[PDB]
Write a protein that binds this DNA or RNA. Sequence first.
DNA 1: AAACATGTTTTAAAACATGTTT
DNA 2: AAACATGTTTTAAAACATGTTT
Lengths: 195, 193, 196, 190
Amino acid sequence: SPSNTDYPGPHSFDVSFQQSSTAKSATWTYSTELKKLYCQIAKTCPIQIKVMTPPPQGAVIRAMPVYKKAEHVTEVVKRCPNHELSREFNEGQIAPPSHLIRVEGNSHAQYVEDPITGRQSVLVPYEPPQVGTEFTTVLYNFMCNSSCVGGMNRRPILIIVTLETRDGQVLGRRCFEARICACPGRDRKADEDSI
Amino acid sequence: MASPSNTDYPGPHSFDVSFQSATWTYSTELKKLYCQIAKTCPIQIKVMTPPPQGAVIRAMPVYKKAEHVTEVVKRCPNHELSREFNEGQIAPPSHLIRVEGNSHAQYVEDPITGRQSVLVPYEPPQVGTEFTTVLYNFMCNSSCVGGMNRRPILIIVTLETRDGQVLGRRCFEARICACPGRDRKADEDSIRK
Amino acid sequence: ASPSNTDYPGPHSFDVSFQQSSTAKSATWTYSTELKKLYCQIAKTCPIQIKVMTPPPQGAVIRAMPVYKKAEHVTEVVKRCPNHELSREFNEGQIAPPSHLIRVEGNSHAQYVEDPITGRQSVLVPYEPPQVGTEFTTVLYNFMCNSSCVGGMNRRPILIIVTLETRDGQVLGRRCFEARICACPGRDRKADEDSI
Amino acid sequence: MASPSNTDYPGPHSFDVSFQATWTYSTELKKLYCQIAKTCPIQIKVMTPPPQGAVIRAMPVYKKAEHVTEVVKRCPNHELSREFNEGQIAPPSHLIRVEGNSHAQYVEDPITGRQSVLVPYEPPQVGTEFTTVLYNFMCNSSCVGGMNRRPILIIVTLETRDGQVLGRRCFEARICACPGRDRKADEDSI
DNA sequence: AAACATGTTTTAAAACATGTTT
DNA sequence: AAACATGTTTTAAAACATGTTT
Ligand SMILES: [Zn+2]
Ligand SMILES: [Zn+2]
Ligand SMILES: [Zn+2]
Ligand SMILES: [Zn+2]
């Protein structure tokens, strides 16, 4: 299984979330001290990238899901069959109906499965912020609930976003848990009460 | 052309269907069948004069709400592809309704309408029995995402001539769920308005 | 492969049967003919009646071998649970291997045997014709574990396979019956009977 | 010698044991009902600190005189089974085990053949009034080949580094499958 | 024999988790 | 949001099966 350890690296690589409009019906929200994303299915979810020094030539940003619990860590993470086949969300998408993670607003995006591992992940060419901007924003879409039967089956997962050299050398990586449910607002308020 | 009829039609042979926290339960006041997935469901047929020759009994599911009637009712992709319940089995894996205990049961998909149903040759009751019994199995829960997506359905059991002329028809709503007992009681209190 | 359990009267019309089952409510054993099943308390002696219609050959023998009833289990040898196999109780000064489920009492020629390849255990007795004026040759069997013995039969039904054989193990006849070794043969039998 | 004593002896340090489902304890019957292998928390209390290498020993013994002389051990089934015996520092025969303490040491008396398990005594955590010991019982009371439904008593003893007894408390233990049911049973029985 | 004892299974009820409707 | 809907899990109670005690 692939690494899931925070490694800031040569470019002080960092992922973070802009304000989580606590406005009850927020499409997604983020608990900082839980290191957890609460996102509704398919809704676009902006992620912030910051680097302390410019990265290599044609560096890239990969996003890969993986289960949290040790017992499942071995098993790939993809969309449950119901979702993989159903008409919704698939319409005319440049992404394979199996991949749980999609990037929005980037035709340079490119999805991928590893012949060997057969693990699914989406890559995007790193691109520095615009003038007077501190972050590079990447738009993500998560295509199944963390409760789809025939998929995550209510089995927690976490996203492993990593920065890499055009040829796969790991320049940095960060990780957060992701529960994609119907009420991120409520499921977060509650999670913050279990303690 | 139009969506299959759902009006009761006793017909010339006075065709009627009836039912005897168990595997299922039937509310007569709501004409609705509550039952667990894949479990066996006994349905009682009754006629008052023997039906014709190759007379058959066909069961076909169809959505209850007008908003959905035009969509064929089938199993969700999950269940249709799963190994579970489809191992040794002659029912095409997509068919919602199956019949167990009858080797003559034949599944059919309309070449034009694409509708799926399962027929059984009609046979009179056993000697001293008043009912011909048919054993039905329902292969998806009503809530199956990718399938019925909790849209209510009606079962349309129809007595037909060897060549598909309808001789009788009875209907009832079917709610395939995990706790027929609970859910039925729910609907019952719901009207306790 | 798993040994055969089909009745085979054979050339000598070999048959097995049981005398009165004395019901008594507290009988040490009882046999249901309609279920071909023997109900009997552990260790208590169990008389079985053999009958032939023509004398068997020379060193002809009678072998009794237990085997699981259900296909799911047929391949597992039937032996005593570890508790009983190690206990002093019953193994006191016995000539019989402490692991063997079936024993025969009252016969010094009885010989226990474990198949070197199959590992199956059985007990043989040299065949002897009935006493003068008697129609049956009687064999006294003892069953050393209750059916429910954890670590052993674990409530898996068994069948007893009594077989008439040639001095060199060629089978001449075979009869079978289910055996339920329990604490209240009376109760349990009545149970199975009401059950149907 | 004679069979180990079972009389309560608070001793100089006012040694006492008590209890805070997987188990339940009846105070009126001084009897512990609990499932096999499931963890059982027991609360020790002293009023003055025990000596140096002071230890807490737990030893099972039959309750009825008819049986007191027989060592209490695991039935052959459980003693040989792989189940509960895989990676274990406890000898597979010992009825009583302690979980969560690497210093726990099992012992068999060379002469009496009795088995028990000791744990070095340690004062409660700061702001806690009880030292807690986690006990596991590895056979049901009914185990054929073992306890064969003969009731037992647990004898938890506070001892000096060299086995001089400083305090002793006792309680009956019934290891079964439904502590709840069985306890209610004994309660109605009276 | 009848009543009990006691581990297992079956059934029933609540409680959860989480998506939808009002 | 608040209430509901609905499959899963947890807990509780009965019912079994079967050996022991009275
Ligand atoms: Zn899905
Ligand atoms: Zn389905
Ligand atoms: Zn045994
Ligand atoms: Zn044991």
